[PDB]
Amino acid sequence: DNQCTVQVRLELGHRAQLRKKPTTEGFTHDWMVFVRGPEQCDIQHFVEKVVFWLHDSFPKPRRVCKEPPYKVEESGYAGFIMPIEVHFKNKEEPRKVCFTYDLFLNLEGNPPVNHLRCEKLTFNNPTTEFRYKLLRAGGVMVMP
Ligand SMILES: C[C@H]1CCCN1Cc1nc2ccc(NC(=O)c3ccc4c(cnn4C4CC4)c3)cc2[nH]1
């Protein structure tokens, strides 16, 4: 009778391409990973920050974006599994969500990578304050 759910959508994705020639350091690939909303949505209303956990080999592997764009642009030798934490402007649980992102590169001779992973987040009975943020972001209220 006082229940609701608010669904919001996140898009995680990455692009990778084999450099025409490797960098001095022998980096073979450029890549970019991101978190975004669908078009006409503003996820910054409910996202405090996004944390991208790069392979321990990278300088400052804990890459924090506190405002859009939520992305990391890098060059590298190899794909890896990237924890991505999306922190919410929520005073209560859940305070964040963690994704395990498959940052895979294109093997020599394959076209560039351009992947998207769509994530629907369902908040059950958010606080008044957090519900407001989710809706401002373009979130959809479902009643029972
Ligand atoms: C454009 C600039 C901005 C700041 C730094 N950046 C250049 C840059 N510095 C870098 C420093 C390190 C790396 N490391 C990798 O690309 C990498 C290394 C080892 C990996 C994997 C996957 N698995 N494994 C282990 C062996 C099994 C990936 C890439 C770097 N790119």
Q: Where are the domains of the chain?
A: 1-144
Ramachandran angles phi, psi of 45, nearest 5°: -60, -35
Experimental method: X-ray
How many angstroms separate the CA atoms of 21 and 117, rounded? Answer: 29
How many angstroms separate the CA atoms of 42 and 22, rounded? Answer: 37
How many angstroms separate the CA atoms of 4 and 127, rounded? Answer: 10
Alpha-carbon torsion (17, 18, 21, 26), positive or negative: positive
Residue closest via CA to ligand 1's atom 13 equals: 58
Pull the structure tokens for residue 48. Answer: 């405090």
Q: Are 120 and 12 in contact (CB under 8 A)?
A: no
47 CA distance to ligand 1 middle (Å): 27
Query: Cβ neighbours of residue 100 under 8 Å, at least 6 residues apart?
Result: 81, 82, 83
Angle at 30 between CA 10 and CA 64, to 5 degrees: 45
How many angstroms separate the CA atoms of 35 and 18, rounded? Answer: 22
Burial-class residue 109 by CB neighbours within 10 Å (0-12, 13-18, 19+). Answer: exposed
Ramachandran angles phi, psi of 132, nearest 5°: -55, -50
Query: Cβ neighbours of residue 86 under 8 Å, at least 6 residues apart?
Result: 10, 35, 47, 50, 96, 97, 98, 99
CATH class of the domain defined by 1-144? mainly beta
Model resolution, angstroms? 1.8
61 CA distance to ligand 1 middle (Å): 9
How many angstroms separate the CA atoms of 133 and 51, rounded? Answer: 20
Q: What is the DSSP letter of 68?
A: S
65 CA distance to ligand 1 middle (Å): 19
Q: Which of 25, 27, 54, 62 to mutate to test the pocket of ligand 1 (most atoms within 8 A of CB)?
A: 27
- Kindly provide the residue ranges of all beta strands, DSSP E only, lying in 66-132, ordered along the sequence: 70-76, 80-88, 96-103, 113-124
Nearest to 9 by CA among 41, 34, 50: 41
